[PDB]
């Protein structure tokens, strides 16, 4: 139907959006409860914690992260150390990829990509008979720089690699914070595979939508990551459900900012201390948007479970130890 143009012929929702369609197809019309929160107007005051990492006493900034991570499951960082040059080469390379001729982006579909670690796809849905999301993406699972050379798009490889390169030390800082109340004062090599074992990065593009209220960019969900890290563009559109009020908060795209949330893996290993919370992506009817999330994960064969350091003081374990790959599968 419309599936043919979008999916089977690989135009995606961007090229479909570029046909100037005045009306949204049935495939993307989200359920009622999704369309209700789209029409939910907000509280004029509540917001996600903003943390300045350039602040000297590094032990107040430490307990700020988990004053954020325990109650909100979400926070933003402003002076994180990743040079702002890199954030704006990668957001460009994202655009120059999606603005590539279609003939060349068909090369990274599940059928045409010469590696499964790379895949350009469109209109996602976890389940069958379910509404699809108004979104195109390029999912990049990191193996090596070698497998980047051979399988990553040349028009956006170096920017992405460099963006991983620079982000990964900020990540190390954040984790060695996080261990605070988890009684883990130094990052070691077994835990490094439990937290930063595997890395995946998506290049997201959200084209302008004719009927923004019927669909979403991303449906209600919690990341299964250890933690994510979100680089938004200047419109943004992240929507987070609070644990205090229970309402939904629109997250403001700050000058030179990352949005870090929390994943199932961290919640499990923290024995429920950290919260992996629900969040959406709104559809915008006026502008095209992009998004470059990094998904920081355990290794696929990592057996995660409550860290021994969290259960030693006579607390009881809330979770089984489970294989990570069997969990996401
Ligand atoms: Na997410």
- Cα separation, 142 vs 148, in Å, equals 8
Q: Which of 99, 89, 85, 108 is nearest to 205 (CA)?
A: 99
Contact 307, 182 (CB under 8 A): yes
All residues with CB under 5 Å from ion ligand 1: 223
- 316: its two tokens: 């009881």
Q: What is the distance in A from the centroid of ligand 1 to the CA of 315?
A: 30
Residues 6 or more apart whose CB falls under 8 angstroms from that of 311 comprise: 271, 317
- Cα separation, 124 vs 206, in Å, equals 13
Distance in angstroms between the alpha carbons of the first and the last residue of the chain? 30
Residue with tokens 């920017």: 159
- 170-176: long-range contacts, CB 8 A cutoff, minimum separation 24: 170/53, 170/77, 170/80, 170/81, 170/82, 170/229, 170/258, 171/196, 171/227, 171/229, 171/296, 172/196, 173/53, 173/81, 174/65, 174/227, 174/260, 175/227
Residues 6 or more apart whose CB falls under 8 angstroms from that of 36 comprise: none
- Cα separation, 62 vs 135, in Å, equals 35
Q: What is the distance in A from the centroid of ligand 1 to the CA of 251?
A: 13
- Cα separation, 243 vs 75, in Å, equals 13
Spatial strand order in the sheet of 218-221 = 218-221, 279-281, 238-241, 248-251
Q: What is the distance in A from the centroid of ligand 1 to the CA of 113?
A: 24
Instruction: Return the bridge partners of 200, or none.
Output: 141, 295
**Resolution reached, in Å?**
2.8
In this structure, the number of other CB atoms found within 10 A of the CB of residue 210 comes to 18
Q: What is the distance in A from the centroid of ligand 1 to the CA of 253?
A: 16
- Cα separation, 320 vs 228, in Å, equals 23
C-alpha angle with apex 124: 120 to 130, nearest 5 degrees? 160
Q: What is the distance in A from the centroid of ligand 1 to the CA of 219?
A: 9
The CA distances from residue 218 to 13, 247, 328, in Å, are: 14, 18, 18
Residue with tokens 């046909």: 19
Rg (Cα) of the chain, in Å, rounded? 20
Q: Which of 284, 294, 2 is nearest to 135 (CA)?
A: 284
Instruction: Please state at what angle helix 157-178 crosses helix 58-71, rounded to 10 degrees.
Output: 90
Contact 195, 175 (CB under 8 A): yes
Q: What is the distance in A from the centroid of ligand 1 to the CA of 281?
A: 9
Q: What is the distance in A from the centroid of ligand 1 to the CA of 264?
A: 11
Residues 6 or more apart whose CB falls under 8 angstroms from that of 58 comprise: none
Which domains does the chain show, CATH number per domain?
1-329 (2.60.120.330)
Residues in the chain: 329
Which residues are documented as binding site for Fe cation? 221, 223, 279
3-state SS string for the chain: CCHHHHHHCCCHHHHHHCCCCCCCCHHHCCCHHHHHHHCCCCCCCCCCCEECCCCCCHHHHHHHHHHHHHHCCCEEECCCCCCHHHHHHHHHHHHHHHCCCHHHHHHHCCCCCCCCCEEEEECCCCCCCCCCCCCEEEEEECCCCHHHHHHCCCCCHHHHHHHHHHHHHHHHHHHHHHCCCCCCCCCCCCHHHHHCCEEEEEEEEECCCCCCCCCCCEEEECCCCCECCEEECCCCCEEEECCCCCCEEEECCCCCCEEECCCHHHHHHCCCCCCCCCEEECCCCCCCEEEEEEEEECCCCCEECCCHHHHCCCCCCCCCCEEHHHHHC
Q: What is the distance in A from the centroid of ligand 1 to the CA of 295?
A: 9
Contact 125, 195 (CB under 8 A): no
C-alpha angle with apex 72: 204 to 325, nearest 5 degrees? 55
Q: What is the distance in A from the centroid of ligand 1 to the CA of 151?
A: 25
Instruction: Return the bridge partners of 198, or none.
Output: 297
Q: After which residues is the chain broken (C to N over 2.5 A)?
A: none
- Cα separation, 176 vs 5, in Å, equals 47
Which residues are documented as binding site? 206, 221, 223, 279, 289, 291
Method: X-ray
Q: What is the distance in A from the centroid of ligand 1 to the CA of 221?
A: 7
Which residues are documented as binding site for 2-oxoglutarate? 206, 289, 291
In this structure, the number of other CB atoms found within 10 A of the CB of residue 319 comes to 14
- 106-112: long-range contacts, CB 8 A cutoff, minimum separation 24: 106/10, 108/138, 108/153, 109/10
Residues 6 or more apart whose CB falls under 8 angstroms from that of 278 comprise: 220, 221, 222, 240, 241
- Cα separation, 203 vs 205, in Å, equals 7
């Amino acid at each position: 139907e419309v599936t043919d143009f979008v999916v089977y012929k690989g135009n995606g929702v961007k090229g479909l959006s570029e046909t100037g369609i005045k009306a949204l197809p049935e495939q993307y019309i989200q359920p009622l409860e999704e369309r209700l929160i789209n029409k939910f107007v907000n509280e004029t005051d509540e917001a996600i914690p903003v943390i300045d990492m350039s602040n000297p006493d590094e032990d107040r900034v430490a307990e700020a992260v988990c004053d954020a991570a325990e109650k909100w499951g979400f926070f933003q960082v402003i002076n994180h150390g990743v040079p702002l040059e890199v954030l704006d080469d990668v957001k460009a390379a994202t655009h120059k990829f999606f603005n590539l001729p279609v003939e060349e982006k068909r090369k990274f579909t599940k059928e045409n990509s010469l590696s499964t670690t790379v895949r350009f796809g469109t209109s996602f849905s976890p389940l069958a008979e379910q509404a699809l999301e108004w979104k195109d993406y390029l999912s990049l699972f990191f193996v090596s720089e070698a497998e980047a050379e051979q399988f990553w798009p040349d028009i956006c490889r170096n920017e992405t690699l460099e963006y991983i390169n620079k982000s990964k030390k900020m990540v190390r800082r954040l984790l060695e914070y996080l261990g605070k109340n988890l009684n883990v004062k130094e990052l070691d090599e077994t835990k490094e595979s439990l937290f930063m074992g595997s890395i995946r990065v998506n290049l997201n593009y959200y084209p302008i939508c004719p009927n923004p209220d019927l669909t979403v960019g991303v449906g209600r969900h919690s990341d299964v990551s250890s933690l994510t890290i979100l680089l938004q563009d200047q419109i943004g559109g992240l929507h987070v459900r609070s644990l205090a009020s229970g309402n939904w908060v629109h997250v403001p795209p700050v000058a030179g900012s990352f949005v870090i949330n929390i994943g199932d893996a961290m919640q499990i290993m923290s024995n429920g201390l950290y919260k992996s919370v629900e969040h959406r992506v709104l559809a915008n009817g006026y502008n095209n948007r992009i998004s470059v999330p990094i998904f920081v994960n355990p290794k696929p064969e990592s057996v995660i479970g409550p860290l021994p350091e969290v259960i030693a003081n006579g607390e009881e374990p809330i979770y089984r130890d489970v294989l990570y790959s069997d969990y996401v599968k």
